[PDB]
Design an enzyme around this catalytic site. Structure first.
Site, short mmCIF file in Angstrom:
data_model
loop_
_atom_site.label_atom_id
_atom_site.label_comp_id
_atom_site.label_asym_id
_atom_site.label_seq_id
_atom_site.Cartn_x
_atom_site.Cartn_y
_atom_site.Cartn_z
N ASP A 92 -7.82 -5.57 -6.24
CA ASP A 92 -7.75 -4.37 -5.42
C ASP A 92 -8.19 -3.19 -6.28
O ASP A 92 -8.10 -3.23 -7.51
CB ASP A 92 -6.31 -4.17 -4.94
CG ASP A 92 -6.14 -2.93 -4.07
OD1 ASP A 92 -7.06 -2.61 -3.29
OD2 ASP A 92 -5.07 -2.29 -4.15
N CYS B 278 -5.28 0.66 -5.20
CA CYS B 278 -3.89 0.54 -5.65
C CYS B 278 -3.90 -0.58 -6.66
O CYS B 278 -3.04 -1.46 -6.64
CB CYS B 278 -2.96 0.16 -4.49
SG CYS B 278 -2.60 1.48 -3.30
N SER C 110 0.78 -1.23 0.00
CA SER C 110 0.00 0.00 0.00
C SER C 110 0.82 1.29 0.00
O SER C 110 1.59 1.55 -0.92
CB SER C 110 -0.93 -0.03 1.21
OG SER C 110 -1.89 1.00 1.12
N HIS D 81 -6.25 -6.01 -2.09
CA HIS D 81 -5.23 -5.11 -1.59
C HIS D 81 -4.18 -5.87 -0.77
O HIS D 81 -2.99 -5.56 -0.84
CB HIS D 81 -5.88 -4.05 -0.71
CG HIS D 81 -5.03 -2.85 -0.46
ND1 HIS D 81 -4.66 -1.97 -1.46
CD2 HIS D 81 -4.49 -2.36 0.68
CE1 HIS D 81 -3.94 -0.99 -0.95
NE2 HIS D 81 -3.82 -1.20 0.35
N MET D 82 -4.62 -6.86 -0.01
CA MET D 82 -3.71 -7.64 0.83
C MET D 82 -3.57 -9.05 0.27
O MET D 82 -4.20 -9.99 0.74
CB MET D 82 -4.24 -7.69 2.26
CG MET D 82 -4.60 -6.32 2.80
SD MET D 82 -5.67 -6.40 4.24
CE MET D 82 -4.46 -6.36 5.55
#
Ligand SMILES: *[C@@H]1O[C@H](CO)[C@@H](O)[C@H](O)[C@H]1NC(C)=O
Ligand SMILES: *[C@H]1O[C@H](CO)[C@@H](O)[C@H](O)[C@H]1NC(C)=O
Ligand SMILES: *[C@H]1O[C@H](CO)[C@@H](O)[C@H](O)[C@H]1NC(C)=O
Lengths: 204, 421
Positions: B338, B341, B146, B397-398
């Protein structure tokens, strides 16, 4: 990164967590119309709660106003508009002892902007009138950190600062009573709060 | 002080340390948690993990993403077989000060550069306290996700400018990060309007609105790039985020996973609360040596500090060019699900970044990447020499949280496979 989308909500959250809405503004429904960028130097920006070493806040800082027609009784920018920039400390001599609560650090009036709606602009310092010259943070050693709050007000159309109530002196904004300042003075002068930023400073 | 937190679950029969490393001459107390490789800590590389925010704890990555244990609804640790400390000793650092268990009474950081100075100091003190993780010549990496897209490149530069450093930097990994705003802000519309591998999530009228305001936003970002000042960068952040990010957010959709709805706390993942409650228990705080009363996943004050200081839109990507030109291997990976990002933006700044081999890189053809552990075609790669860009299939995202096995394959093939996927 989820919290970096809405600068309006972000502002409210900060004001709440640090008691700026109750100790200073005295209005928990306050909605910012824009955001006030303030900086002493490239290394000394006031960024909603950061800490700054006293010596860096020695001289008067620069200001910028970013209006965003969306963060919104309502403030609608115009050309006649004149603004008032205030700086106060509601933690004088400390966050607990309010014998001098609301120490007046700065009060500039009759400020005009150089200039779906959106714009970022600095102020035209020319025809302004300083009622209370700038004085940097000077918290008592050991008193802990103090809140240094900047507030931008829109003046009523056509009325210049020569008509605002006088300010005896700094401690209590010359009102005598404890915990009184910008809130009291801004109301008796019909000023409209438009924005606010703040920082912390401490003397160990 | 340093402590042995083994009595907690987390990772039995693997030595580890928690505690603080101080820079008292500045009143800065950095909390960290170290885990040795479940293999050979004397041979395997050391990895420093950093979460973003800015202002979020790295303990999130530990318990929620890639660490040795996650936390159940009953506050009991559950072993993670795909932890990143499988073949590397990992370091989880709470940074900047006042994030997680890290604190500081006086000072406070408002931008990435300053945070970089602090991390460099922490690492010096660290490898000083634990020569064991350098002596044997182990490789050292810095990985994060991130907003670490801001941290990593600047951080790496900071450490490489010191000639007297007591450790080396082998490479850096960056997943779903924000590194080159000017380029990346061009891909929020296509990602949200059916051109990123997922059905559009925004009605046509909105997608068009986003296109119209795009120019203005980019211009403002360019202005920040050129003057790097508050006056220019703060407004740029406000205008672009409202124009390009707000629409998507108002739909209630998850900014971290386009397939989900944001539900729960300020981070859209209800379960994060569980680790917050676990870290706030009386016996856990004590066993860990916490010197802070209440723990929180993210500190939104320092998050706002960075925002109102104009750090969000700075041109930190230029640091990547320096690094690459110096032959520092860099891995830029991103899950394709995501949004904030997204992979489109990350592939874009990666394809146009200037550097000595930018021509050979741009020429390279993207190929399929097969995860070693699972043997699945887990993504699309593109690399030349020491620069690699990985698109991770079905990752939000993760990444590690969505595809733990493929994620472990990625880091290991990189850390042990000669920095080449
Ligand atoms: C990782 O460590 C395990 C130890 O159980 C070993 O079996 C495996 O081959 C290692 N793979 C590497 C070095 O990536
Ligand atoms: C980095 O590794 C060690 C740091 O402990 C140092 O002695 C060495 O000179 C550096 N790398 C080399 C061999 O240039
Ligand atoms: C990736 O593998 C080859 C080319 O790399 C080809 O079959 C196709 O593009 C991809 N395979 C899949 C998953 O269909």
């Amino acid at each position: 990164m989820n919290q970096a989308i809405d600068f309006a909500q972000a502002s409210i959250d900060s004001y709440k967590k640090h008691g700026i809405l109750e100790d200073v503004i005295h209005d928990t429904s306050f909605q910012p119309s824009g955001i006030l960028a303030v900086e002493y130097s490239s290394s000394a920006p006031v960024a909603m709660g950061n800490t700054l070493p006293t010596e860096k806040a020695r001289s008067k800082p620069q200001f910028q106003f970013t209006f965003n027609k969306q963060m919104q009784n309502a403030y609608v920018p115009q050309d006649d508009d004149l603004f008032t920039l205030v700086m106060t400390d509601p933690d004088a001599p400390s966050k607990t002892d309010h014998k001098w609560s609301e120490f007046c650090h700065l009060v500039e009036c009759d400020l005009k902007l150089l200039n779906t709606e959106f714009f970022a602009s600095e102020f035209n310092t020319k025809g302004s009138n300083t009622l209370i010259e700038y004085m940097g943070p000077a918290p008592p050693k050991g008193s802990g950190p103090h809140r240094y709050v900047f507030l931008l007000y829109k003046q009523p159309k056509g009325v210049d600062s020569s008509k605002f109530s006088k300010i005896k002196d700094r401690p209590n904004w010359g009102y005598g009573t404890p915990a009184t300042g910008v809130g009291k003075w801004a109301k008796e002068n019909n000023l409209q709060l438009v924005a606010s930023n703040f920082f912390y400073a401490e003397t160990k | 002080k340093i402590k042995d937190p083994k009595i907690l679950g987390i990772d039995p029969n693997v030595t580890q340390y928690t505690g603080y490393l101080d820079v008292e001459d500045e009143d800065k107390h950095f909390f960290f948690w170290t885990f040795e490789s479940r293999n050979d800590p004397a041979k395997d590389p050391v990895i420093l993990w950093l979460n973003g925010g800015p202002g979020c704890s790295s303990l999130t990555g530990l318990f929620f993403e890639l660490g040795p244990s996650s936390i159940g609804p009953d506050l009991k640790p559950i072993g993670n077989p795909y932890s990143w400390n499988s073949n590397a000793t990992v370091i989880f650092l709470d940074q900047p000060v006042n994030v997680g268990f890290s604190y500081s009474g006086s000072s406070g950081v408002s931008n990435t550069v300053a945070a970089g100075k602090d991390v460099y100091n922490f690492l010096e003190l660290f490898f000083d306290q634990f020569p064991e993780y350098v002596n044997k010549g182990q490789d050292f990496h810095i990985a994060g996700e991130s907003y670490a897209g801001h941290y990593i490149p600047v951080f790496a530069s900071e450490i490489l400018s010191h000639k007297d450093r007591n450790f080396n930097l082998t490479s850096v990994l960056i997943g779903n990060g924000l590194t080159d705003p000017l380029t990346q802000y061009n891909y929020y519309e296509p990602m949200a309007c059916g051109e990123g591998g997922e059905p559009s999530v925004l009605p046509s009228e909105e997608c068009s609105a986003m296109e119209d305001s795009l120019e203005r936003c980019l211009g403002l970002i360019e202005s920040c790039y050129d003057s790097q000042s508050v006056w220019s960068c703060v407004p740029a952040t406000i205008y672009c985020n409202n124009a390009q990010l707000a629409p998507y957010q108002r739909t209630g959709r998850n900014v971290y996973d386009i397939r989900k709805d944001c539900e729960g706390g300020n981070l859209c993942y209800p379960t994060l609360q569980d680790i917050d409650d676990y870290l706030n228990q009386d016996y856990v705080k004590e066993a860990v040596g916490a010197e802070v009363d209440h723990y929180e996943s993210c500190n939104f004050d320092i998050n706002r500090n960075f925002l109102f200081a104009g750090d969000w839109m700075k041109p930190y990507h230029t640091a990547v060019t320096d690094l690459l030109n110096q032959d520092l291997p860099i891995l830029v990976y991103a899950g394709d699900k995501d949004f904030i990002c997204n992979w489109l933006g990350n592939k874009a700044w990666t394809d146009v970044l200037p550097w000595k081999y930018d021509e050979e890189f741009a020429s390279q053809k993207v190929r399929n990447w097969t995860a070693s552990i699972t043997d699945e075609v887990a993504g699309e790669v593109k690399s030349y020499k020491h620069f690699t860009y990985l698109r991770v299939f079905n990752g939000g995202h993760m990444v590690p949280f969505d595809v733990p096995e493929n994620a472990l394959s990625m880091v290991n093939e990189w850390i042990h496979g000669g920095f080449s996927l």
